[PDB]
Amino acid sequence: VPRGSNPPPPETSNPNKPKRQTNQLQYLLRVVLKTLWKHQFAWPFQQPVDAVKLNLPDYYKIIKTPMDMGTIKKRLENNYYWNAQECIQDFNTMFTNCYIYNKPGDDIVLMAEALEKLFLQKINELPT
Ligand SMILES: CCN1C(=O)c2cc(N3CCN(C)CC3)nc3c(NS(=O)(=O)c4ccc(F)cc4F)ccc1c23
Numbered sequence: 001v002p003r004g005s006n007p008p009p010p011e012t013s014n015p016n017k018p019k020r021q022t023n024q025l026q027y028l029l030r031v032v033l034k035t036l037w038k039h040q041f042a043w044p045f046q047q048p049v050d051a052v053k054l055n056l057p058d059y060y061k062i063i064k065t066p067m068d069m070g071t072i073k074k075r076l077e078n079n080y081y082w083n084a085q086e087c088i089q090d091f092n093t094m095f096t097n098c099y100i101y102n103k104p105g106d107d108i109v110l111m112a113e114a115l116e117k118l119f120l121q122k123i124n125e126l127p128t
């Protein structure tokens, strides 16, 4: 697994971007991320895919918009998102990446599918 194969992690802090605190963004961090973080299948989704350590040499040849819940946590914390939808899109990207890279019905896919169902359940309680 060649050195330099991992990209830098996604950007999580941009001081140029304006910042606001929103009941929806607060819900995404305090409820949604918390609940998914603690799920029995969360571990593989908690940090950027380390292609070297996990022996996935073609990951970043295939996946050009990587996303993970560690990145999302940091983005919420740093007020990276102006609206809830930007954050929801990062979650969707994380699940879609798994469905692109992996064969349907593989173990990691079933793990993603369970998390995604829980995510969508929690998203339906998103406040006004
Ligand atoms: C070492 C004991 N063990 C198994 O033999 C085993 C099989 C297993 N399967 C294989 C069959 N597939 C349809 C369902 C998940 N999941 C987990 C499992 N579930 S898990 O943490 O979501 C998981 C971890 C690694 C992995 F490669 C696949 C997994 F589903 C934990 C522990 C075990 C397993």
Ligand SMILES: CCN1C(=O)c2cc(N3CCN(C)CC3)nc3c(NS(=O)(=O)c4ccc(F)cc4F)ccc1c23
Pocket: 043, 044, 045, 049, 054, 056, 097, 098, 101, 102, 106, 107, 108
């Ligand atoms: C969610 C991001 N992601 C993947 O899309 C992914 C695929 C993956 N594969 C699939 C191909 N297979 C031959 C090797 C491992 N391993 C891990 C992986 N390695 S792992 O934690 O040892 C692991 C977890 C669950 C599992 F079912 C199999 C694993 F190898 C971590 C994270 C990911 C993966």
